[PDB]
Amino acid sequence: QDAYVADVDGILDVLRAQVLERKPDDIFQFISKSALSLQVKDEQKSRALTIIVFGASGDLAKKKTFPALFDLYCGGLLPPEVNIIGYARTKVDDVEKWKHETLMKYFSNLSERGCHAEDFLKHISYFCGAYDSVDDFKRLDAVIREKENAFKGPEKGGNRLFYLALPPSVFASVCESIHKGAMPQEVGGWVRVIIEKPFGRDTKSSAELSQALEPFFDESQLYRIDHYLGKEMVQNIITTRFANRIFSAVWNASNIACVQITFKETIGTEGRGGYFDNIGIIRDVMQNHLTQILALLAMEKPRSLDAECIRDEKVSVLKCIEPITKENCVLGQYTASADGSIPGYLEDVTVPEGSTCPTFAVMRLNINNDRWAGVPFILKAGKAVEQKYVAIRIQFRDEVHPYGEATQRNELVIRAQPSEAMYVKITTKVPGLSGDLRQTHQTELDLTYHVRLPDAYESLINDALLGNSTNFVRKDELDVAWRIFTPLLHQIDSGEIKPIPYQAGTRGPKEADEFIANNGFKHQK
Amino acid sequence: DAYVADVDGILDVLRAQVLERKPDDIFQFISKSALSLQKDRKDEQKSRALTIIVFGASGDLAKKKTFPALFDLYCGGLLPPEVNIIGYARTKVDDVEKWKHETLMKYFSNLSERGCHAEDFLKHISYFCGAYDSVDDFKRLDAVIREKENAFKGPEKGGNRLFYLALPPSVFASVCESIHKGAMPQEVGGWVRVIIEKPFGRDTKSSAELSQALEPFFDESQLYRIDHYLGKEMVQNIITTRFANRIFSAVWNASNIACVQITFKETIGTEGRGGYFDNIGIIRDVMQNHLTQILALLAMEKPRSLDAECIRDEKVSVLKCIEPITKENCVLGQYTASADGSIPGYLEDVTVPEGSTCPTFAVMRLNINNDRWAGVPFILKAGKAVEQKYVAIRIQFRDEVHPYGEATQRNELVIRAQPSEAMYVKITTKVPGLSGDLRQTHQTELDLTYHTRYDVRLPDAYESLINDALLGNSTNFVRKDELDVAWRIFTPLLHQIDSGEIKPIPYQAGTRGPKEADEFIANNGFKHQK
């Protein structure tokens, strides 16, 4: 009765999303040929499922979390009768208008998925309330409990995933509202809460935040997101090394010379620089993303492939890492480039005067155990640099004999961005006319055995839906991870080291490239 | 017409690529090689004059085996422009140049993709009629050689002389004395090298005798015992992949390797030449000489250079650690008629005696006993009239039982050198199809060598040693002491076979061989993917 108006405005705006995602020569025919085009998985369905997204119209939820859920709906990884609930403080007039202009503008690839698009919005309902009012959680508890019992399944109760797409200052009170008014029925079901970075800003900050949530949810239920890490690149580190004797036997200090984990991004902080100015490149991606990546490379053998034995080795090996020292660190801060297409970092009005905040840093970490003593581990992240390339690179020790200068170090690389790739660099015979044994030429050998593809974030959200806690930092490791970085962070705030300038689009400060070369890395030539 | 005469030009390259290389998962091969072609975009042998004398010039080997080989090297530019080749045999030749076109040129490869390059080559060939023992006839040869050495416009003195003995071994001792007394290179300069052909004795004492008969005339720097089945391409796979790369160098020992199998297969029978084989046996045919040389290259310790005689130093080095093969560690076979009937039995041959215990098939276990190899079983297998035609290396590394259990099996490196060359490492990887579990794995194959040039029909295996001998490369040729240590490994077994203590088990052609043999491989550390 309400809105035949909103029903078409939804139809027209999906078609407008496609005309600007596939630029049409003949717009008139695109709007029309794609007009009528919009015409054990045993255990998904055992019980009903509800996804509650808080901060539902915040920038994080609308632009990254709800569109993520859309991709799983099209991929068929969500149960058929899932319901999603958007939770936000501000009221909305008619919700279906809100779905078409707050949620659906940010759904990507709508020319392959557009027919599913307006079906997807039928699974989301809106709920307006406060993140601290126990009564509104009793009204939320009522609204979800009335579709849990409307469930067509064999087995009763319901499973509840609460996504806190909120700033961290709100976390402790939303987790109290769940405990006192929104826990799943004892008739059956689990509760899992996904919490978002920043998980503190140093050792004491993050122990306090984790102690605020301790009485409300244990580690079996809390899922700390690191949405820059994907399932694709974690089974590369675990399966290639631990199922294969070729790599398992060579994965130590007796054969490895240098390990570098590199995170590059071509874009700086466009207009959110003031928000970054309090973070720093270390806190943004290094302490969380690159360190969990590093945890998987250096871990001893987990005595199972169960989630908590993998996480068990992540704490054991991070506990052997000596905290970064100020001499072992180089920082940069990006300025305007000679191209002129990017303004400087300080050319942003959002950032205060004269701040020494780094947009680029490279550091050395020394793992102290039998397996890794002596091997330098190099972490590098930088904003507004030459290219967008996140990759792992391991350099094995050179076989100087007998080939001398006819061979160089074997190299294993794992790349996650822009495109996934895994390959090893080795020296092989050249099919010379006469040939020669001294005439070799380095080659690249692939290790990947190549329909909708889920990104890193979707298969992290799906990992939480399936009960897989492997790729989420857990309480003890988050603390020991912080204890690694904060002595450096404290000394940087004290100004004991200062950032070195570099213009954007360059590789970064050239003292950083010097630091890499002086710490066991050898370049092809 | 419109650029896809070019596009069909490089699925042409992939078509030849996939059927030279058993993928069995052809699908990602053609892709992983479609994208590897994305990134694919000697003065001194005029120093001296060169003369090649091939004995037995109209013997069956020389006309069919060696003369066509030299022709292919002529087109490859691997022979000097002023090269002199002379055929030496006694048989009557009234007209010589007619004899070259129509006893020699009928066996020249390709014949018309070359163009008239065939008749250019034959113009470097001369005939010489004489006896393999007449010291006077060699002084007449020395004169005719000095009359082709003197036609050289080089600055350089002298001439280089390569004598190819396309003869049975009983003639060897007399032509090497005849060369010594009347046909050695000029004193002004040049080397002499002798290539002697396949059967070097038939046991320790037979072959020791033949080498002391040649000892007084030529040292190991001058004698080149040829084995046409090795080839440079596969020894550069064995040597370079392991010794230039720490990934493989560190796992190339007993602590990571479980089983290595060297296999020689042929679909062909004795071709009716059976009586001829009957005194040789498959062990002497390919196992003691060819596959043992292959095994030597896999198991050798690090040579402290890549010079030929430091490589050979490590080859006799490791063969000295092999306990002699024992008969309990051996099973033999003999091929019979096929179920199709397309291959007749070995004994269905008129050339072979009744009641012969000659093996057409053998698989054995060898124990290399030193720090690097103690415990690792080495399995040699040779067979005629079997499933398929392939010589290949199979090395199986020990399984990582934990943590992947039955989601993984043993890692495998294989080297297969043929017309069907291939090198690949087979290991377990994640499957990208997200049902997002780790136990959810699949073994796949990873190639290291691709066929990218294809400009060519470049040197085959046999053509690569002749060229190696011209270049002074002793690497793929067995040495006096090394030939001895190889015989001492096999001859206790060979005597017991001739004494009949073990006999060959019957098998039909086209099958894998005797069924007791495959069980023997299974009982000696070998595991099937399943």
Author numbering:
A (entry chain B): 10 to 48, 63 to 473, 478 to 552
B (entry chain A): 11 to 51, 64 to 552
Please share text taken word for word from the publication where this structure appeared.
The housekeeping enzyme glucose 6-phosphate dehydrogenase (G6PD) (EC 1.1.1.49) is the first and rate-limiting enzyme of the PPP. It catalyzes the oxidation of glucose 6-phosphate (G6P) originating from glycolysis to 6-phospho-D-glucono-1,5-lactone (6PL), whereby the cofactor NADP+ is reduced to NADPH. The LdG6PD monomer contains three domains: an N-domain (Q5-K49), the NADP+ binding “Rossmann-like” domain (residues D50-I248), and a β + α domain (residues D249-K552).
The crystals of the apoenzyme obeyed P121 symmetry with four monomers in the asymmetric unit (AU) and diffracted to 2.8 Å. The apo form crystallizes in space group P121 with two dimers (AB and CD) in the AU. Via P121 symmetry operation, a tetramer can be formed from each dimer (ABA’B’ or CDC’D’). In the apo structure, the N-domain of subunit A (NA) interacts with the flexible loop (T471-D482) of both subunits. Residues E30A-K32A are bound to the β-strand S442A-A444A (β13). Additionally, NA (apo structure) interacts with not only subunit A but also B; the N-terminus of helix α2A (Q38A) is bonded to the flexible loop residues T471B and H473B. Linking P1 to subunit B, results in no dimeric interactions between NB and subunit A, but in all our structures there are multiple contacts with the “Rossmann-like” domain of subunit B. In the apo form, α1B (A12B-Q27B) interacts via van der Waals forces with the helical residues D117B-W121B (α4B) and E135B-E141B (α5B).
